[PDB]
């Protein structure tokens, strides 16, 4: 509990969530995940951004907070929804977007922490979404500070196949897990990182 | 969001098919759980039924605490279900399920204090005839029914729970019998007695395995047969011992011959009729 | 057949300590009672309240 601990979640909202079939039930165990994570420690703290087809948005900036957390990521994810960027119409999500806002904020919370003393954090990706050519610079320049700045990325490819975001990992020494069965997210979410 | 109410059907329905006899569903029920359930559950076949509603609760351990308060909410007909229900199995899923109601703490103190089931729990206990299975859940029952109470300020059943001081006599027997594991789950009971409830009240043994054996020296006890009239006799009564099994020994040419004492009735029998 | 039962202990030693049993049936004291007779090297008919005197006095003897 010494060391303050950022966990940025970062989720991808891409429609391929329709071929999910639930969208609620992960946001409902991804509430659960951060409500223990939350509970594990007084120094843990947590961000959530949206990475979406269109740009990334965040739906939340301590345990506390929690009420405040899930009310927060239902009602921004309901917003998200809209018609654009539907189905397939868009298979990629802007993730090197929701890595920038993640590195902007963990850099804020940083220097903050830095008056005080050091901050660990790492950040996870919930990957539902596919990779381009034309987000290769982009991803990998946000992937490449992370890993200077000694940020782990984390991923969870509940489907698809985003081949950026397992070079992500491998990269910045963090986690790659590709999900055999997606019901299983919640065990995967604690277990697997 | 579609796909949900599919894959999850799907193992609802192998649970459903091989519901009856034996134990199939406690893995299956598991992963249904994660995926007002409590209100549609209580349609389907109670067996397994109990299953995925002893897992859920367990399961359970921001979004949560809304799932702990909806279980909260019908907690009574899960509960008004255990009784009604009420083999060793179906026990040990009476009580299991209950246990775990009762450490999600959505279980009503009052309610219980006055119920069947708590009769149920010491019932098994003290009767000698129940099996180590029945017992360890029975236990279990208990210790969590008393964990759930964390005040006894306001809670009747910090009452009933005192029905533990009658497992002493059964406690005496288990121990008179080796049953180790009889006597561990009594001391549990007490424990967490104690527990809730503590403020308110105030080479060498080479030797050893020879000396072992020096205890166990064998002879049997036995009928003799002798002055048998003829032959046919022996033979006869010599072959219904031995598909009985108990000849100890037999010699044609004597007319003699030799059961241990648990099937000297047999023979008895057999030799008044035939 | 069925003419006679008696309940007895048949016990079934080796033909080793069989006859030190017969000996322990003889050349005693209050003894002599415990042997029936010898069904077989190995068996022997014997005792019943005897077969505790018996196995005890074997252990005591070498």
């Known amino acids: 509990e010494d060391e303050l601990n950022l966990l940025v979640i970062v989720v991808d909202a891409n429609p391929i969530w329709w071929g999910k079939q639930t969208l609620s039930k992960c946001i409902d165990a991804v509430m659960v995940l951060g409500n223990s994570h939350l509970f594990m420690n007084r120094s843990n703290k947590l961000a959530v951004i949206a990475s979406h087809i269109q740009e990334s948005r965040f739906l939340y900036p301590k345990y506390e907070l929690l009420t405040s957390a899930n009310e927060v990521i239902v009602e921004e994810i309901k917003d998200l929804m809209t018609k654009s960027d539907i189905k397939g119409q868009h298979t990629e999500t802007l993730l090197a977007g929701s890595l920038a806002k993640a590195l902007c904020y963990i850099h804020r919370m940083n220097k903050e922490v830095k008056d005080n003393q050091e901050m660990k954090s790492r950040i996870l990706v919930i990957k539902a979404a596919e990779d381009s050519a034309l987000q290769y610079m982009n991803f990998m320049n946000v992937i490449f500070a992370a890993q200077k700045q000694n940020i782990l990325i984390d991923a969870c490819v509940l489907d698809s196949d985003s081949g950026l975001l397992q070079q992500a990992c491998d990269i910045t020494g963090g986690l790659y897990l590709k999900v055999p069965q997606m019901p299983s997210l919640l065990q995967y979410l604690l277990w697997v990182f | ?274 | 057949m069925v003419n006679v039962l008696k309940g007895v202990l048949i016990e079934c030693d080796p033909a080793m300590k069989q006859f030190l049993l017969y000996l322990d049936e003889s050349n005693a004291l209050g003894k002599k009672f415990i042997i029936q007779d010898i069904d077989d090297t190995h068996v022997f008919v014997i005792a019943e309240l005897v077969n505790v005197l018996q196995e005890r006095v074997g252990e005591l003897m070498d």
């Open chain 2, 1 to 274: 969001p579609g796909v949900l109410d599919r894959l999850y059907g799907h193992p609802a329905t192998c649970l459903a098919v091989f519901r009856e006899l034996p134990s199939l569903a406690k893995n299956w029920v598991m992963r249904m759980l994660f995926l007002k359930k409590e209100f549609s559950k209580a349609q389907e076949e109670s067996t397994g039924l109990l299953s995925g509603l002893r897992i859920w609760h367990t399961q359970l351990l921001n979004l949560r605490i809304a799932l702990l308060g909806g279980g909260k909410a019908w907690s009574d007909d899960t509960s008004q279900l255990g009784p009604d229900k009420h083999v060793l199995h179906f026990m040990v899923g009476s009580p299991s399920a209950a246990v775990s109601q009762d450490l999600a703490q959505l279980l009503s103190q009052a309610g219980l204090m006055k119920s069947t089931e708590p009769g149920e729990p010491p019932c098994i206990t003290s009767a000698g005839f129940q099996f180590l299975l029945l017992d360890t859940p029975a236990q279990l029952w208990y210790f969590m029914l008393q964990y759930l109470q964390t005040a006894q300020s306001r809670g009747m059943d910090l009452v009933e729970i005192l029905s533990f001081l009658f497992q002493l006599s059964f406690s005496t027997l288990g121990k008179d019998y080796s049953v180790e594991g009889m006597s561990d789950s009594l001391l549990n009971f007490l424990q967490h007695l104690r527990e809730f409830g503590l403020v308110f009240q105030r080479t060498d043994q080479i030797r050893l395995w020879e000396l072992e054996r020096d205890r166990l020296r064998f002879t049997e006890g036995v009928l003799y047969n002798q002055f048998l009239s003829q032959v046919d006799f022996e033979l006869l009564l010599a072959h219904a011992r031995e598909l009985g099994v108990l000849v100890f020994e037999n010699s044609a040419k004597r007319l003699m011959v030799v059961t241990p004492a648990g099937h000297s009735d047999v023979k008895r029998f057999w030799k008044r009729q035939k």
